[PDB]
């Protein structure tokens, strides 16, 4: 199918809340080798974030249920097998996304916006892997997440103003990585706080096109800070 | 053994993985034994959530289609997508209906579950009617009507107006009168009758079923207020 019609069906599927079809469309567009506009990248992110999200939440529910006490080794075996199945699906999704990133998106992007967006995305899905990983696999997944995040962070700090939405969201997710993956709440708090302070510092000079997004993101930074100060 | 299957069905429910849930309950149903009340609720929840996404998706895509200029070159993609969704919906409803006619209704032993299953038959035949055309639409609407009517009579004869199942049957059957038959007065009269008769004998209702009956009744007068506009 032509790229234009693939986009048309990605948007239609999004309207229909059918995110598997949306993600399949955008995966096709990406594999065609063509660089994606901001719009098209956001279609990719929405699609795959929705596909994986259900698995993440299911895994959380099932894990929590697994910690319940007074449960039969038999029932516990069933719970663990189900959590393992969800885990498998999640790993497959994140794998597909990362193959798209390394093979097409990251590779063919010299543009700082796109480079940061794709490196951030990589850190995100490697983080999703890291939250369900075992043993040495775990250390590798963490190191990869952290690495991609770090590269995105540097590129942003050298190329993008503090008010830019991708720099801010990148800071957000990187700090959540510090808090939940590395269990270093201090460095997460300083990361988010530095992002927010640098943003408010230059808020009066921010253009009125990206104001709507960066304000929301900033409010998320502050939310996580307050939550992380119990 | 339905035990392990039920365990997994509940896990899936709490995890909102309704495909897995519908698989579990389909297998249980096909074991051939009559379903308990929790198990009937599990079946209904599962397949309700499976078909729901396709009902909503279909509604959206159809709305877009009927608000798109007919000469538009991009119309046939919308059409093809709506037809795919509609195909999935048909598949699912057909599965449910086969489960009911072949297993559940044939072996239902008490009036409560018989009314439950007949109501379900009417519900999913109605889901088909929402997207059917021509003679197909005529006969599917007819089947829905018939299921609802049988369940309705049995409920009148064998249950109290406060029973959550009877109330729900009145709710969905009224909605059938409104959305399918297009007689708002009769739908309003079904809803109001069920609600008034329920409040009349609200004191003969189980404390545990109280939340459910209350819920349904609120849906009934919500519908009544809506339709009266």
């Amino acid at each position: 199918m032509e790229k234009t019609e693939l986009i048309q069906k990605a948007k239609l599927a999004e309207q229909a809340e059918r995110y598997d079809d949306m993600a399949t469309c955008m995966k096709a567009v990406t594999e065609q080798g063509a660089e994606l506009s901001n719009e098209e990248r956001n279609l990719l992110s929405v699609a795959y974030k929705n596909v994986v999200g259900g698995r993440r939440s299911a895994w959380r529910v099932i894990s929590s249920i697994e910690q319940k006490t007074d449960t039969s080794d038999k029932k516990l075996q069933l719970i663990k097998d189900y959590r393992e199945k969800v885990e498998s699906e999640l790993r497959s999704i994140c794998t597909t996304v990362l193959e798209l990133l390394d093979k097409y998106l990251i590779a063919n992007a010299t543009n700082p916006e796109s480079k940061v967006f794709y490196l951030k995305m990589k850190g995100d899905y490697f983080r999703y892997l890291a939250e369900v990983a075992c043993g040495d696999d775990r250390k590798q997944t963490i190191d990869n997440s952290q690495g991609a995040y770090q590269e995105a962070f540097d590129i942003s700090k050298k190329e993008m103003q503090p008010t830019h939405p991708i720099r801010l969201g990148l800071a957000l997710n990187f700090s959540v990585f510090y808090y939940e993956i590395l269990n270093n709440p201090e460095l997460a708090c300083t990361l988010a706080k530095t992002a927010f302070d640098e943003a408010i510092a230059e808020l009066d000079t921010l253009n009125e096109d990206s104001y709507k997004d960066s304000t929301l993101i900033m409010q998320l930074l502050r939310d996580n800070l307050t939550l992380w100060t119990s | 053994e339905k035990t392990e299957l039920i365990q997994k069905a509940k896990l899936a429910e709490q995890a909102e993985r309704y495909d897995d849930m519908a698989t579990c309950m389909k297998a249980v149903t096909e074991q051939g034994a009559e379903l308990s009340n929790e198990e009937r609720n599990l079946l209904s929840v599962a397949y309700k959530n499976v078909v729901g996404g396709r009902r909503s998706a279909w509604r959206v895509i159809s709305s877009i289609e009927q608000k798109t200029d007919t000469s538009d070159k991009k119309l046939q993609l919308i059409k093809d997508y709506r037809e795919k969704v509609e195909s999935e919906l048909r598949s699912i409803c057909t599965t449910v209906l086969e489960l009911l006619d072949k297993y559940l209704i044939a072996n239902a032993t008490n009036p409560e579950s018989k009314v439950f299953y007949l109501k379900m038959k009417g519900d999913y035949f109605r889901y088909l009617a929402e997207v059917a055309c021509g003679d197909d639409r005529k006969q599917t609407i007819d089947n829905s009507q018939g299921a609802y009517q049988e369940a309705f009579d049995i409920s009148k004869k064998e249950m109290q107006p406060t029973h959550p199942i009877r109330l729900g049957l009145a709710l969905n059957f009224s909605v059938f009168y409104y959305e399918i038959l297009n007689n708002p007065e009769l739908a309003c009269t079904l809803a109001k009758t069920a609600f008034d008769e329920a409040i009349a004998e609200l004191d003969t209702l189980n404390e545990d079923s109280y939340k459910d009956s209350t819920l349904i009744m609120q849906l009934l007068r919500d519908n009544l207020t809506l339709w009266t506009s």
Binding site: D124, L172, Y179, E180, L227 | S44, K48, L169, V175, E179
Partner: peptide, 17 residues
Amino acid sequence: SYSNTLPVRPRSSSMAA
């Protein structure tokens, strides 16, 4: 609107859709 019918369908905040 659509009529109602019987059977119906802490963490950290990361960047959303």
